[PDB]
């Protein structure tokens, strides 16, 4: 988290057919399921992977960034680690901080 660079995404409508890109059959089908008419998917006969042509009219999400104005917080001292208190790695990865 960097309050000076908040990551957001903005919906835009594709104005022009995009360049095709490769993807798994499973993923290509997922793109087709969402976009219907507005994406073509085609088996690549050799690889067995699929090409994914997102068409004009499709919706994209383009990352953008906000500057936020709360830059300061009361934070647990830098270096604090549940490990130094004796808590296992297995508990740390299971559990919310």
């Amino acid at each position: 988290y960097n309050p000076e660079k908040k990551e957001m995404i903005q919906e835009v409508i594709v104005e022009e057919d995009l360049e095709p890109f490769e993807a798994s059959k499973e993923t290509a089908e997922q793109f087709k399921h969402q976009h219907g008419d507005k994406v073509d998917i085609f088996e690549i006969p050799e690889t067995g992977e699929y090409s994914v042509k997102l068409l004009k009219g499709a919706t994209l999400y383009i990352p953008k960034a906000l500057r936020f104005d709360r830059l300061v917080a009361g934070q647990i001292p830098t270096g604090w680690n549940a490990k130094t208190y004796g808590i296992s790695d297995d508990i740390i990865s299971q559990v919310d901080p």
């Binding site: 903005q10 919906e11 835009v12 409508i13 594709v14 104005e15 004009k56 009219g57």
Partner: peptide
């Protein structure tokens, strides 16, 4: 405009 108007 950017959120409620059609592409282009």
């Amino acid at each position: 405009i950017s959120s409620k108007m059609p592409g282009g």
